[PDB]
Amino acid sequence: VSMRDMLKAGVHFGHQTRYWNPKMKPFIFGARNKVHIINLEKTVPMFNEALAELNKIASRKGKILFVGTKRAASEAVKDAALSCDQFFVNHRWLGGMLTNWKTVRQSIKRLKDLETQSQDGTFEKLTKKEALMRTRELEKLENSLGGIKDMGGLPDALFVIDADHEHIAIKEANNLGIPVFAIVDTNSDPDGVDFVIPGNDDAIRAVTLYLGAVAATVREGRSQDL
Amino acid sequence: ELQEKLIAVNRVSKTVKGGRIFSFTALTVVGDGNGRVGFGYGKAREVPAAIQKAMEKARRNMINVALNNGTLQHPVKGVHTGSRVFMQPASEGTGIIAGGAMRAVLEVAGVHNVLAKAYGSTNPINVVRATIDGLENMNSPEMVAAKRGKSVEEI
Amino acid sequence: GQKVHPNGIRLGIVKPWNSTWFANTKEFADNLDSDFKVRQYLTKELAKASVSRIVIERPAKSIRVTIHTARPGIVIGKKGEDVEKLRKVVADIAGVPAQINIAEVRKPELDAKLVADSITSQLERRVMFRRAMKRAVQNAMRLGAKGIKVEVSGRLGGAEIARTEWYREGRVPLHTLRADIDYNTSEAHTTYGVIGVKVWIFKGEI
RNA sequence: GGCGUAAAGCGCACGCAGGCGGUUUGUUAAGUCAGAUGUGAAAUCCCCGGGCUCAACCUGGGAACUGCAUCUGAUACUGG
RNA sequence: AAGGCGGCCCCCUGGACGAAGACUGACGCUCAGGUGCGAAAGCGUGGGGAGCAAACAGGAUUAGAUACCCUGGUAGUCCACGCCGUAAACGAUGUCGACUUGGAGGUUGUGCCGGCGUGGCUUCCGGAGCUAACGCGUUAAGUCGACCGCCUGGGGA
RNA sequence: CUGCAUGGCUGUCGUCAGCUCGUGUUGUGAAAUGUUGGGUUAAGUCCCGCAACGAGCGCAACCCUUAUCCUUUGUUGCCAG
RNA sequence: GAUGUUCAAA
Numbered sequence A: 001v002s003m004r005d006m007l008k009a010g011v012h013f014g015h016q017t018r019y020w021n022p023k024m025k026p027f028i029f030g031a032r033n034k035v036h037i038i039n040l041e042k043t044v045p046m047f048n049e050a051l052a053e054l055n056k057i058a059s060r061k062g063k064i065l066f067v068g069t070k071r072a073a074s075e076a077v078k079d080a081a082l083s084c085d086q087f088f089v090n091h092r093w094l095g096g097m098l099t100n101w102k103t104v105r106q107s108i109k110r111l112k113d114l115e116t117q118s119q120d121g122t123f124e125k126l127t128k129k130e131a132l133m134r135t136r137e138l139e140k141l142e143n144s145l146g147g148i149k150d151m152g153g154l155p156d157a158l159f160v161i162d163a164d165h166e167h168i169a170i171k172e173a174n175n176l177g178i179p180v181f182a183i184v185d186t187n188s189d190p191d192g193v194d195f196v197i198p199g200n201d202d203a204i205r206a207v208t209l210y211l212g213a214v215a216a217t218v219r220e221g222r223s224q225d226l
Numbered sequence B: 001e002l003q004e005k006l007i008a009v010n011r012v013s014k015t016v017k018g019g020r021i022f023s024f025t026a027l028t029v030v031g032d033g034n035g036r037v038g039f040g041y042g043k044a045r046e047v048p049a050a051i052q053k054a055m056e057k058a059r060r061n062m063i064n065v066a067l068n069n070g071t072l073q074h075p076v077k078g079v080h081t082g083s084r085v086f087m088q089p090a091s092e093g094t095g096i097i098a099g100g101a102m103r104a105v106l107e108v109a110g111v112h113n114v115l116a117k118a119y120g121s122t123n124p125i126n127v128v129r130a131t132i133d134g135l136e137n138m139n140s141p142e143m144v145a146a147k148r149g150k151s152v153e154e155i
Numbered sequence C: 001g002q003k004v005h006p007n008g009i010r011l012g013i014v015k016p017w018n019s020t021w022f023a024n025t026k027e028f029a030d031n032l033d034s035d036f037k038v039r040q041y042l043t044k045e046l047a048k049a050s051v052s053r054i055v056i057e058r059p060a061k062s063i064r065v066t067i068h069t070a071r072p073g074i075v076i077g078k079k080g081e082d083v084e085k086l087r088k089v090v091a092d093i094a095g096v097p098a099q100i101n102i103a104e105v106r107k108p109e110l111d112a113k114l115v116a117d118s119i120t121s122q123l124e125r126r127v128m129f130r131r132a133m134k135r136a137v138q139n140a141m142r143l144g145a146k147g148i149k150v151e152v153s154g155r156l157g158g159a160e161i162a163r164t165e166w167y168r169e170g171r172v173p174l175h176t177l178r179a180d181i182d183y184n185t186s187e188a189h190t191t192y193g194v195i196g197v198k199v200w201i202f203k204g205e206i
Numbered sequence D: 001g002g003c004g005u006a007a008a009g010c011g012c013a014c015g016c017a018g019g020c021g022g023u024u025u026g027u028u029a030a031g032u033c034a035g036a037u038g039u040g041a042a043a044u045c046c047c048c049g050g051g052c053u054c055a056a057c058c059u060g061g062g063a064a065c066u067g068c069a070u071c072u073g074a075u076a077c078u079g080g
Numbered sequence E: 001a002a003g004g005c006g007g008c009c010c011c012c013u014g015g016a017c018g019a020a021g022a023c024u025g026a027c028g029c030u031c032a033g034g035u036g037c038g039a040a041a042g043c044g045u046g047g048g049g050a051g052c053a054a055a056c057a058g059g060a061u062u063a064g065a066u067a068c069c070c071u072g073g074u075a076g077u078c079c080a081c082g083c084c085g086u087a088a089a090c091g092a093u094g095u096c097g098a099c100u101u102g103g104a105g106g107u108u109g110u111g112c113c114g115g116c117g118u119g120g121c122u123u124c125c126g127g128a129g130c131u132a133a134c135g136c137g138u139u140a141a142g143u144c145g146a147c148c149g150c151c152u153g154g155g156g157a
Numbered sequence F: 001c002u003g004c005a006u007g008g009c010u011g012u013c014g015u016c017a018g019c020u021c022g023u024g025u026u027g028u029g030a031a032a033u034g035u036u037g038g039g040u041u042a043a044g045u046c047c048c049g050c051a052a053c054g055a056g057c058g059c060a061a062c063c064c065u066u067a068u069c070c071u072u073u074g075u076u077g078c079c080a081g
Numbered sequence G: 001g002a003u004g005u006u007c008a009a010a
């Protein structure tokens, strides 16, 4: 986490100048070959304070949800969230995942029952027919709700890897008054995200840097609580 | 300690191949007093089911209002969808003088002395939204002081 | 479209036959005619007795009449004076010895016959029909109905044109055969016109 | 209070009267504002009382009638 | 300016915009009355008349068919010079000025070193905002100031 | 006598694939959304996308018949030995 | 791709 760290990963890159967002004028340095460049000098200083805020949330034994429905950071977010023993969303953000907690909880309870019965539970009465249906349903409910299966509640803080891609998620967080930390890009808008973080999300090694950064803050805070 | 008032009830209809499908809507205002007031709109087949849903939404969307004693801080004008409501602080003991929909919002809010007149459309949903907009518009002297870096010179 | 009798389609699969005996063609029709005379006789003077189902079995020795009344008190009276007289008449109908068996309707609002008959009586008494159907549905729900459906059709409320109103709460799966559906139909002879009351009661499968 | 579609932009332009007018200095003080003074009848109205047994009613004082005129001063803006 | 304006050539003539400087010194904005311009149809007089085509006629269609369809066909359309002064003359949005995120074009200039900058006009989408909604959205229906025209239930009108 | 006062029953599209609801979200609101779209299926069948997430009635399945095997009984049916 | 008029109120 410094000036040299992010520039090495090449996270300063942005979307074509024609696909830019006007509310990104403070976090934009310039344009090269019709490609916007986020100013590292504007972001890094205010990037650390957002990571400190995540520690302040983690200190209260808060639940941090990490949303990366983007293919680029798909496996990145899952591993980052699981490394810190926190929850995540990866296959796709279902609408009403936060606002309609009652209906999502119903499906999570069925998912848990399918899991505890498909493996540990007796496979007797398989009839050879319904076995392939129930297991497939379990896989569908695992990809969609597996990350938040053991959350049993509403996230204290929300982490988003792309504001425009997860606009629905940020909108649900804003409705529930949940603080949002999002890696916004020249194309995205920062109105909904409480702690705006400028930076490229397209690069694989770039997102892993941000996901590794936040992961260390929560681990640093759980250790401080211990 | 939470006050619930039903501003209005109406029977709406959705035509289908068979005929009319009647439904009921309820506009309710929830205020605990001390300037916290919320409104909710609910729809159901029955009037009791409709009022409960409206009360639920209202409790979720309660907003805070700056209040001087039992009266408004300053004269306020709030306009929503062609409904222009007007509000102004009144003296102690003057009571509440407002249209019934508007009077409901203010009493639950915690306002006891006010002179309110409603212009434009008198539709209850629009007027209560304009009243809520106006109550939010009202500003404390301390907020004005912090905004202009003034040490409460006005009071 | 047109719906098959819920009892009829699954009578072999689930519902018990009201008549459960064996005959040949010599007396098959005779027995059926006798059953009809027993049933129509019982219903006319046991209208206040809330009789629901008349199940008849025919041993080559006697006639066994299982009656599913909600109130045993009235159908039997004191020390069974009304039931002995009932036996003497029903016996004379089929010209054979008569056995009367009385069944207990512990859960009445869960029986399609009783609810339909009550709704028809309310229509005869001019109780507004929108309220009675809703009340019956609520009673069935508060006492354990998985599904309910009431269809009062006819010149409702002295209307010039007949109308069809139905109200369904819960779940009524007629197409699923293993489903159990208690279905009955009563008729209201209101002064303006005949009013048909249909009731479906879903109480689980298997 | 309005005028795309509910009533409501002249078919379009030019242009006199009229309305409005960038910027600076000086000057005037017409508008403007301040002070003072006179007047603004009584009744009414309102306030604090008084008398009719109460009340209506009647009445004492005050407030009000901030409108008009003159005198004096200010000049920030408008006007010359 | 609007109404409008299409083969080419010549003659006379109006406006707009760009560039770098000189010059005047508020000479401005708007405009009741007033005046000019103003599609098509019409009207007057003199031409012209190919095509089209009100009217009119015949044929069909149809219960009927003063229509639609067909076959014709006069005014008119065309020109000169008058008159008329009206259109859903519409962006159904008066004119002038300032301010207020953007993105893709078209079209006419213009500097710089294939790109970049900078003006004029114009099309689409769209943010805030506004709007009853549709929508408008830097060419506003956003936020303002100047002046003018107009409206104030539906008919009657 | 009146099916144009009715009930019950029945034809029809048509076995057509549809009809809705809970909660969430959107819109001042009536309402919408799901139920749309890309495929696919006999089918709102299924899948991917998608502010929707699920659920019900219909669809299918369950019921009946037939196609094949196994076991039991053997008469009034059967005959390898 | 010819033609097909109408329908007081509750």
Ligand SMILES: [Mg+2]
Pocket (backbone or CB within 6 Å): B120, B121
């Ligand atoms: Mg009005």
Ligand SMILES: [Mg+2]
Pocket (backbone or CB within 6 Å): C002, C004
């Ligand atoms: Mg059938």
Ligand SMILES: [Mg+2]
Pocket (backbone or CB within 6 Å): D001, D002
């Ligand atoms: Mg008006």
Ligand SMILES: [Mg+2]
Pocket (backbone or CB within 6 Å): none
């Ligand atoms: Mg109009």
Ligand SMILES: [Mg+2]
Pocket (backbone or CB within 6 Å): none
């Ligand atoms: Mg115009």
Ligand SMILES: [Mg+2]
Pocket (backbone or CB within 6 Å): none
């Ligand atoms: Mg000036």
Ligand SMILES: [Mg+2]
Pocket (backbone or CB within 6 Å): D029
């Ligand atoms: Mg003076």
Ligand SMILES: [Mg+2]
Pocket (backbone or CB within 6 Å): none
């Ligand atoms: Mg006086």
Ligand SMILES: [Mg+2]
Pocket (backbone or CB within 6 Å): none
């Ligand atoms: Mg002009």
Ligand SMILES: [Mg+2]
Pocket (backbone or CB within 6 Å): none
């Ligand atoms: Mg004029």
Ligand SMILES: [Mg+2]
Pocket (backbone or CB within 6 Å): none
């Ligand atoms: Mg002409």
Ligand SMILES: [Mg+2]
Pocket (backbone or CB within 6 Å): none
């Ligand atoms: Mg002529």
Ligand SMILES: [Mg+2]
Pocket (backbone or CB within 6 Å): none
């Ligand atoms: Mg011709």
Ligand SMILES: [Mg+2]
Pocket (backbone or CB within 6 Å): none
């Ligand atoms: Mg012709």
Ligand SMILES: [Mg+2]
Pocket (backbone or CB within 6 Å): none
């Ligand atoms: Mg006109």
Ligand SMILES: [Mg+2]
Pocket (backbone or CB within 6 Å): none
């Ligand atoms: Mg016009």
